[PDB]
Design a protein around this ligand. Structure first.
Ligand SMILES: [Ca+2]
Length: 223
């Protein structure tokens, strides 16, 4: 399968579903008490759902935990989606196992051409509305900054990256907001935006997590 595929149950154990009566966004578990997501996913009364596969069915590996806190990045701009990152505290610590695991923070930024894993539940159709119910996966390289910016002129900042193919076809536009981009076992990206939807020269656009690591560590330790 060249593109969107079915991950397999609990193959991506750091993957979280944010629920407000429905699944509205994804997120990543970074330690037993904290989740990172996109700031554009900011909402009151979240329930964070861990160990999911089929989000409509109780399949036995779940943990359902209310969010106690959310902290949107102080420089988040909801017009440009610059600094599209938010931290979510769990009311109770999650219980960690094979299917519920934390993802490490990067120690450096990943380079262009690095193959990454993008995951989520969101829309599959470049042209229509089709929302599947088990965890979906995509493997794509990080594009060069040039390639990214020339696809979205004036719209890409240092705190963003693109991943995929300049011919489009395979993309995570609405492909599940808030969800992870993981490269070499490290969390590099957060599913942020993408003008169009898998259009020719319209990749996915991700929050460049490697710029925020000091913010994340300082903030979680203080909160
Ligand atoms: Ca389930």
């Amino acid at each position: 399968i060249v593109g969107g595929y079915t991950c397999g149950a609990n193959t991506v154990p750091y993957q979280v579903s944010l629920n407000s009566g429905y699944h509205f966004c994804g997120g990543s578990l970074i330690n037993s008490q904290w989740v990172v997501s996109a700031a554009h996913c900011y909402k009151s009364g979240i329930q964070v759902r861990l160990g999911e596969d089929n989000i409509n069915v109780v399949e036995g590996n779940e943990q359902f935990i209310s969010a106690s806190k959310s902290i949107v990045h102080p420089s988040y701009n909801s017009n440009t989606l610059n600094n599209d990152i938010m931290l979510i505290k769990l009311k109770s610590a999650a219980s960690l196992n094979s299917r519920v695991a934390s993802i490490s923070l990067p120690t450096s930024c990943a380079s262009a051409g690095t193959q990454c894993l993008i995951s989520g539940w969101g829309n599959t159709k470049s042209s229509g509305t089709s929302y599947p119910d088990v965890l979906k996966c995509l493997k794509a390289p990080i594009l060069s900054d040039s390639s990214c910016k020339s696809a979205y002129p004036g719209q890409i900042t240092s705190n963003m990256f693109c991943a995929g193919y300049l011919e489009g076809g395979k993309d995570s536009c609405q492909g599940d907001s808030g969800g992870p981009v993981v490269c070499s076992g490290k969390l590099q990206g957060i599913v942020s935006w993408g003008s169009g939807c898998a259009q020719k020269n319209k990749p996915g656009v991700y929050t460049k997590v490697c710029n925020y690591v000091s913010w994340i560590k300082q903030t979680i330790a203080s909160n």
